[PDB]
């Protein structure tokens, strides 16, 4: 499970303020082949949508899409005007109370994932 | 390895006071699908037996059975008078000295496990 | 993935005569460590129910339960009046037309499973 | 390894007429949860390019892209004008003489893959 | 599970003429990355010993050792006087009657293995 | 993934002082079957070589060989003048700055590995 195109997804973090929709999501991305990538992708909104592109940060050139249904992750990354990588992952997690409300919840991943990057056709 | 019927077993803990039989066993059980289960199952006895049902706690409605031979775990849970789940797992571990005796040992799991629940026929 | 108490489950087969309930179910069990076990477990009923013990065959001293819900299998072997082992698996499968009436379906496994037997406490 | 949005990819097949580019590629997709999907996706071109969408077949409403570099597969299913799913796999394979001219090669998968579909955002 | 130095081991075959020691052993090695390697490694002796190097065949420049204890395989390829690679696998198998005398047994693999080659230091 | 011959490799640590060659390497080895092995194997040199035997410590009776190319590990252990075990593993990792130089780097493993021991023929 190493390789120049394999990444370790880890440290998944979610905030469900009314116990339903996320208002915050993030995770960490690490190199696997002794490379140097150690990046925490993260987004916030008042009511985040399933199956919607969000940026991971300004100048990250990365976007993700999340489906809370089955905790599925879509990951995309522009590398040039010609190369784009994409990857799918699943991110197991549990929730515990957040105390910033009655129905406030904190979601933490309970397992790491290892994605393989594929090149997205320019179409 | 997510799902509404998948659980993460973790934080395995054992006490072998004379270096043989356990006198204490426990582990943690977490949800995997963003659910809320975060429970530490645990039992104690002067000399615990292999292949014997033990409660995980009062009002847990859960019992487990352990086989120290191959570190195998049986997990059972009453959900109603009609539904009972069971699962099998294996729990790798090592021991280190406990210092509360010459042949005292502490056992800690070295890997998480992911069980799938099946329904136990009422027979 | 080998061992004295590890078995391969394969060749899963069921019939849905009206394309709903099974009226026949079966699979094969092989040894894994150079043992000699190569046993085909199978059962029939007019309409089979999920989560109900069925015999694997006369003088097999084995029983199983199946949940078509999540393709969960529960396996039980009586070795003696004093020793019983159990195990759990998931059996991925697909369906297709059986040819005996338009609503007739045949289900086949599409993936091997490897089970680990644990001792069931007596009482 | 089962689910409503889990598919088995198997029976991978490609032709390298001069033993370099593919001029034909295909594989099979089956359901995993007792579903009925058993679809063979295949495409041809004079010389196929890596990282380019190809149709799986007329009225399949499916497309795929393949990278012979790392045997990466990208799969896309249009379910409606409003819903599209995607998935990623790696398809281990080997080559051998095809017999139609000395430089002719045939590639076969040597391992099944199991994909998980996620929803692709619209826009 | 692909790579330039990843091989599939399959089609394991041994003969226990008296149902104890092997007097014949073999398996197949295939490439995994669209390579062309499809080599069948096999050896015979009057009575074969565990944990002893055997040749895979004349001018194969390969050797293996097998432990019927835990079905462990050790594989060695001499590429040149300067480069040797090694790898390790476990080969799940079962036995059955061979038909050539009552004590005659045939062993077959029941699961593929995927090995990773590493360089063996010289000296 | 337990067994009397299975070990957990963990806590991989590497030092690449000029950003290339390692000058230090180490990792931890733990029992998996409730045994007592908890050992940190480690070596240092001004410029460490790929594919070279290094001791894990005085009186460890263990040597390893590393290939930084694909982060592959060879592990060997003398148990008597008659028994020697060997195992192969792969050890995913990433690097971050070390600050003891411009091109100084610290490598930490990002995933555990589970090796199976095989017996090395005496030849």
Dist CA C111 CA C90 (whole Å)? 9
- Are A113 and A98 within 8 A, CB to CB? no
Dist CA A74 CA D87 (whole Å)? 9
* D71, D72, D118, best to mutate vs chain A, most A CBs in 10 Å: D118
Report in angstroms the alpha-carbon separations of E44 from E10, E17, E101: 18, 12, 19
Chains F and D touch (3+ CB pairs under 8 A): no
Dist CA E105 CA A29 (whole Å)? 52
Dist CA E109 CA E40 (whole Å)? 14
Report in angstroms the alpha-carbon separations of C107 from B56, B102, C25, C65: 39, 59, 9, 17
Which segments within B31-111 are labelled E, that is strand?
38-44, 54-55, 62-67, 72-78, 84-90, 93-97, 105-109
The closest of B77, B2, B4, B68 to B39, measured between CA atoms, is: B77
Dist CA C9 CA C30 (whole Å)? 7
Phi and psi based region of residue E57 (left: phi greater than 0; alpha: psi -120 to 50; beta: remaining) = left
* F70, F91, F92, best to mutate vs chain A, most A CBs in 10 Å: F92
Closest partner CB to A94 (pick from B1, B34, B112): B34
Chains B and E touch (3+ CB pairs under 8 A): no
Q: D108: exposed, middle or buried (C-beta count within 10 Å: 0-12, 13-18, 19+)?
A: middle
Look at the block and give the residue holding tokens 């136990």: B120
The vertex-A74 CA angle with A71 and A79, nearest 5°, equals 155
Q: Say whether F1 and B111 touch across the interface (CB within 8 A).
A: yes
- Are F75 and F64 within 8 A, CB to CB? yes
Q: Say whether D123 and A51 touch across the interface (CB within 8 A).
A: no
Tell me the residue length of chain D: 123
Which residue from E minimizes the CA distance to F64? E121
Dist CA E101 CA F28 (whole Å)? 51
Give the number of other CB atoms < 10 A from CB of residue E15. Answer: 20
Tell me how the structure was determined: X-ray
The closest of E85, E123, E81, E77 to F53, measured between CA atoms, is: E123
Dist CA B96 CA B94 (whole Å)? 7
The closest of A88, A70, A86, A69 to A121, measured between CA atoms, is: A86
Give the tokens for residue D69.
């570099």
- Containing H/E element for D98? none
- Are A65 and A52 within 8 A, CB to CB? yes
Give the tokens for residue C6.
């590890």
The reply to whether CATH 2.40.350.20 applies to domain A5-123 is yes
Closest partner CB to F94 (pick from A36, A112, A114): A36
Dist CA F118 CA E68 (whole Å)? 11
Phi and psi based region of residue F59 (left: phi greater than 0; alpha: psi -120 to 50; beta: remaining) = left
Give the tokens for residue D28.
């099979």
Dist CA A60 CA A39 (whole Å)? 9
Tell me the residue length of chain B: 123
Helix (H, G, I), strand (E, B) or coil at F34: coil
Cβ neighbours of residue B105 closer than 8 Å, sequence gap 6 or more: B15, B16, B17, B19, B95, B96, B97, B98
Closest partner CB to E70 (pick from C2, C10, C36): C2
Dist CA B21 CA B24 (whole Å)? 9
* C45, C119, C122, best to mutate vs chain B, most B CBs in 10 Å: C119
Dist CA D40 CA E76 (whole Å)? 39
Query: Resolution reached, in Å?
Result: 2.7
Look at the block and give the residue holding tokens 């598919």: D7
The closest of D5, D7, D2, D3 to D73, measured between CA atoms, is: D7
Q: Say whether D31 and C70 touch across the interface (CB within 8 A).
A: no
Considering only CB atoms, which chain A residues are within 8 Å of F91?
2
Enumerate the domain spans of chain C. 5-123
Q: Give the F-side interface with A, CB within 8 Å.
A: 14, 68, 70-71, 90-96, 107, 110-111
Q: Give the A-side interface with D, CB within 8 Å.
A: 5, 50-53, 65, 67, 70, 72-74, 86-88, 90, 116, 118-121, 123
């Amino acid at each position: 499970t190493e390789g120049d195109y394999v990444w370790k997804i880890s440290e998944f973090y979610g905030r469900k303020p009314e116990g339903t929709y996320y208002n915050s999501l993030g995770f960490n991305i690490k190199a696997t082949n002794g490379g140097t990538l150690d990046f925490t992708c993260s987004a916030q909104a008042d009511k985040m949508e399933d199956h919607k592109w969000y940026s991971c940060g300004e100048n990250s050139f990365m976007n993700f899409s999340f489906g809370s249904d089955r905790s599925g992750l879509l990951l995309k990354q522009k590398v040039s005007d010609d190369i784009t990588y994409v990857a799918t992952a699943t991110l197991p997690n549990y929730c515990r109370a957040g105390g910033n409300g009655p129905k406030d919840f904190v979601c933490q991943g309970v397992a790491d994932a290892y994605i393989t990057l594929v090149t997205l056709p320019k179409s």
